[PDB]
Design an enzyme around this catalytic site. Structure first.
Site, PDB file in Angstrom:
ATOM      1  N   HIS B  41       0.878  -1.177  -0.034  1.00 51.03           N
ATOM      2  CA  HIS B  41      -0.007   0.020  -0.117  1.00 51.03           C
ATOM      3  C   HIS B  41       0.960   1.252   0.080  1.00 51.03           C
ATOM      4  O   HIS B  41       0.218   2.501  -0.091  1.00 51.03           O
ATOM      5  CB  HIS B  41      -1.061  -0.086   1.163  1.00 51.03           C
ATOM      6  CG  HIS B  41      -0.599   0.198   2.389  1.00 51.03           C
ATOM      7  ND1 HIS B  41      -0.230   1.490   2.955  1.00 51.03           N
ATOM      8  CD2 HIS B  41      -0.544  -0.510   3.516  1.00 51.03           C
ATOM      9  CE1 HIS B  41       0.260   1.179   4.152  1.00 51.03           C
ATOM     10  NE2 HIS B  41      -0.089   0.174   4.661  1.00 51.03           N
ATOM     11  N   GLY B 136       2.408   6.274  10.233  1.00 46.04           N
ATOM     12  CA  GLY B 136       3.679   6.019  10.165  1.00 46.04           C
ATOM     13  C   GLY B 136       4.228   4.774  10.439  1.00 46.04           C
ATOM     14  O   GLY B 136       5.216   4.332  10.233  1.00 46.04           O
ATOM     15  N   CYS B 138       3.165   1.409   9.861  1.00 44.91           N
ATOM     16  CA  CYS B 138       3.144   0.620   8.702  1.00 44.91           C
ATOM     17  C   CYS B 138       4.641  -0.027   8.517  1.00 44.91           C
ATOM     18  O   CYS B 138       5.438   0.743   8.184  1.00 44.91           O
ATOM     19  CB  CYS B 138       2.359   0.926   7.494  1.00 44.91           C
ATOM     20  SG  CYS B 138       0.670   1.527   8.030  1.00 44.91           S
TER      21      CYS B 138
HETATM   22  C1  LIG Z   1      -8.628   5.546  12.163  1.00 44.41           C
HETATM   23  O1  LIG Z   1      -7.914   4.613  11.975  1.00 44.41           O
HETATM   24  C2  LIG Z   1      -7.658   3.984  10.745  1.00 44.41           C
HETATM   25  C3  LIG Z   1      -6.841   5.022   9.782  1.00 44.41           C
HETATM   26  N1  LIG Z   1      -7.377   5.112   8.516  1.00 44.41           N
HETATM   27  C4  LIG Z   1      -8.640   5.243   8.173  1.00 44.41           C
HETATM   28  S1  LIG Z   1      -6.328   5.766   7.525  1.00 44.41           S
HETATM   29  O2  LIG Z   1      -5.279   6.598   8.240  1.00 44.41           O
HETATM   30  O3  LIG Z   1      -7.134   6.414   6.557  1.00 44.41           O
HETATM   31  N2  LIG Z   1      -5.583   4.605   6.664  1.00 44.41           N
HETATM   32  C5  LIG Z   1      -6.174   3.897   5.715  1.00 44.41           C
HETATM   33  C6  LIG Z   1      -5.784   2.434   5.604  1.00 44.41           C
HETATM   34  C7  LIG Z   1      -6.405   1.456   4.587  1.00 44.41           C
HETATM   35  C8  LIG Z   1      -5.749   0.145   4.294  1.00 44.41           C
HETATM   36  C9  LIG Z   1      -4.368   0.087   4.830  1.00 44.41           C
HETATM   37 CL1  LIG Z   1      -3.768  -1.522   4.500  1.00 44.41          CL
HETATM   38  C10 LIG Z   1      -3.844   0.985   5.558  1.00 44.41           C
HETATM   39  C11 LIG Z   1      -4.226   2.085   5.981  1.00 44.41           C
HETATM   40  C12 LIG Z   1      -3.406   2.918   6.851  1.00 44.41           C
HETATM   41  C13 LIG Z   1      -3.774   2.486   8.223  1.00 44.41           C
HETATM   42  O4  LIG Z   1      -4.452   1.871   8.746  1.00 44.41           O
HETATM   43  N3  LIG Z   1      -2.557   2.988   9.136  1.00 44.41           N
HETATM   44  C14 LIG Z   1      -2.440   2.931  10.529  1.00 44.41           C
HETATM   45  C15 LIG Z   1      -1.816   1.687  11.053  1.00 44.41           C
HETATM   46  N4  LIG Z   1      -1.455   1.648  12.346  1.00 44.41           N
HETATM   47  C16 LIG Z   1      -2.143   2.657  12.942  1.00 44.41           C
HETATM   48  C17 LIG Z   1      -2.734   3.549  12.646  1.00 44.41           C
HETATM   49  C18 LIG Z   1      -3.180   4.414  13.762  1.00 44.41           C
HETATM   50  C19 LIG Z   1      -3.846   5.607  13.336  1.00 44.41           C
HETATM   51  C20 LIG Z   1      -3.800   5.795  11.801  1.00 44.41           C
HETATM   52  C21 LIG Z   1      -3.410   4.975  11.059  1.00 44.41           C
HETATM   53  C22 LIG Z   1      -2.880   3.817  11.386  1.00 44.41           C
HETATM   54  C23 LIG Z   1      -4.083   4.513   6.728  1.00 44.41           C
END
Ligand SMILES: COCCN(C)S(=O)(=O)N1Cc2ccc(Cl)cc2[C@H](C(=O)Nc2cncc3ccccc23)C1
Ligand SMILES: COCCN(C)S(=O)(=O)N1Cc2ccc(Cl)cc2[C@H](C(=O)Nc2cncc3ccccc23)C1
Ligand SMILES: [Cl-]
Lengths: 305, 298
Positions: B41, B136, B138
């Site tokens: 991703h 950050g 990931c």
């Molecule tokens: C509200 O929490 C979910 C965050 N997301 C909706 S996002 O930030 O838009 N988002 C979308 C997404 C969709 C698919 C995949 Cl594979 C990865 C990702 C990302 C994700 O999941 N990255 C994170 C990992 N661990 C911890 C987190 C903590 C906070 C915020 C991102 C964190 C980013």
């Protein structure tokens, strides 16, 4: 999201761990530059431990009586000296893996990572706190002496603890890296016991602010309290007094969540009175006191949920 | 004495962490030999269509203060493999292993290719992990160490709406029914890892906590009928066999300890704690208990 008991990455400390042997005793040493630091009780027998005269035991030793092993390499000891309860062994090779470091003496309530070692080899890393009674609730077996406690804020390792002994209640006592013990302990086998312990109030408050940052507010109430009334109640549950320094230190977390320190103190008073009633706070059914305000700011998000 | 949630020493893994940047996304990568592994991703939904439009120079890889040169790229399931022109001189002896729910591992949480912390956790029965991750994180990895060999078992990909985490093995296969995109996804109902609670009760007895011990025993079938009522995973004969050593050391048969667990489930702790906890802990395996109560080194 999430909140874990998190330790610092241990690599910078792993590259400093060595094995120190003197006669029949084997324990761990910390190799920084051309010096190996270890507990002075490595020169003792078990009999010697009742009333050891370390100065008399040390004068009878020569450099070649101390065997130091770094991995599969034998280091040569070219000098020795005692500083308080630590032995400093001068070696002929500087550690090429020596990180940027400092020796810091911490106060009760402060947290640190412990790299538990046996035979100069690291076995595990865990996070802990210096209790108000100056002991640590560690996980240590025989041969763990010389294992160290540290923090790594930025790229500098701050060594704050060296393990020396286990007390009869299963808790641990040790020194700073200058060999001064934390607490009224001595490196002697005596009728020595940990004093009555208390809960680190400023740390429980920090952890309640962490729970609010992560989205949980079930425990808040509409009340406030004076600092004196809070302390009168807190001391009845064996909680450490909360000082104006602690209130000042919690300022940033209070501004981030919008909950005044004394309002959070009111919630803590109510939690002590009521218990959790089948609920948890950050996955715990007890009030957690081994996260400092600094640890919460470092681990939690800068944006409250 | 003492019993802590203990992680493996992280140094062998710290020397593999790098920062990977593609466009606006910055995350962590694992540099082993001449390959950097990271979540696919980072290029973000046809993933092969997104990848075909990228060239080697679009991926910026940073190891400490050194920029690594990407000379090739390929995708394996949900993991991107960036071929670099420099082999990691700090590559440890390693294997890629896929773990089962209930198994534990250490997580080296990283941000901008720099390790910030290490913690111990378990793969839940619902295939999520209750980690501590921010934006950050990931690409941060999970691992175990066996002698001098690092077994990489997890790579972090995302956070689910309940605050729990989801990721893949190092071959890019997800743990759980998750997908790497922004869609309606939720963790399923979780259960307690029964064999792990039993191991932790043996750790408590070893450390001198015996108040919950009783004179009773149970059959495996009666225990499982009760355990199903409290959302506990079924206990198998394999779990009983695996707990054999701890049973011989303490003198408490596995079904003898099951009768203790049944009473704790039906009546609670009654104001008491076990190893400083008011809840039954399920993130220590039988092997973790044996290792911590014996001092195995790496
Ligand atoms: C509200 O929490 C979910 C965050 N997301 C909706 S996002 O930030 O838009 N988002 C979308 C997404 C969709 C698919 C995949 Cl594979 C990865 C990702 C990302 C994700 O999941 N990255 C994170 C990992 N661990 C911890 C987190 C903590 C906070 C915020 C991102 C964190 C980013
Ligand atoms: C079994 O009770 C531990 C204390 N002992 C009676 S002992 O093992 O004989 N003992 C006495 C003693 C007295 C003073 C000093 Cl400075 C050190 C030491 C030693 C000590 O404390 N070493 C240990 C440290 N940490 C953890 C342990 C765990 C288990 C067993 C030793 C552990 C040895
Ligand atoms: Cl301090």
């Amino acid at each position: 999201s999430g909140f874990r008991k998190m330790a610092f990455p241990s690599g910078k400390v792993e590259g400093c761990m060595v094995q120190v042997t003197c006669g029949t005793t084997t324990l761990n040493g910390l190799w920084l530059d051309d010096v190996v630091y270890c507990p002075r009780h490595v020169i003792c027998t078990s009999e010697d431990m009742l009333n050891p005269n370390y100065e008399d035991l040390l004068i009878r030793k020569s450099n070649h009586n101390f065997l130091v092993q770094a991995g599969n390499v034998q280091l040569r000891v070219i000098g020795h000296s005692m500083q308080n309860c630590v032995l400093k062994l001068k070696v002929d090779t500087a550690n090429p893996k020596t990180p940027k470091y400092k020796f810091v003496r911490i106060q009760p309530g402060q947290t640190f990572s412990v790299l538990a070692c046996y035979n100069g080899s690291p076995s595990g890393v865990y996070q802990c706190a210096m209790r108000p009674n100056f002991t640590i609730k560690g996980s240590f077996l025989n041969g763990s002496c010389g294992s160290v406690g540290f923090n790594i804020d930025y790229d500098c390792v701050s060594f704050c603890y060296m393990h020396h002994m286990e007390l009869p209640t299963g808790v641990h006592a040790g020194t700073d890296l200058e060999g001064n013990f934390y607490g009224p302990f001595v490196d002697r086998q005596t009728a020595q016991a940990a004093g009555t312990d208390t809960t680190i109030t400023v740390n429980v408050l920090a952890w309640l602010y962490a729970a609010v940052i992560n989205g949980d507010r079930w425990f808040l109430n509409r009340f406030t309290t004076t600092l004196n009334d809070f302390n009168l109640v807190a001391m009845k549950y064996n909680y450490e007094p909360l000082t104006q320094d602690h209130v000042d230190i919690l300022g940033p977390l209070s501004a981030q969540t919008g909950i005044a320190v004394l309002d959070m103190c009111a919630s803590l008073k109510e939690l002590l009175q009521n218990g959790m009633n089948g609920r948890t706070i950050l996955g715990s059914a007890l009030l957690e006191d081994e996260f400092t305000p600094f640890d919460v700011v470092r681990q939690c998000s800068g944006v409250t949920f």
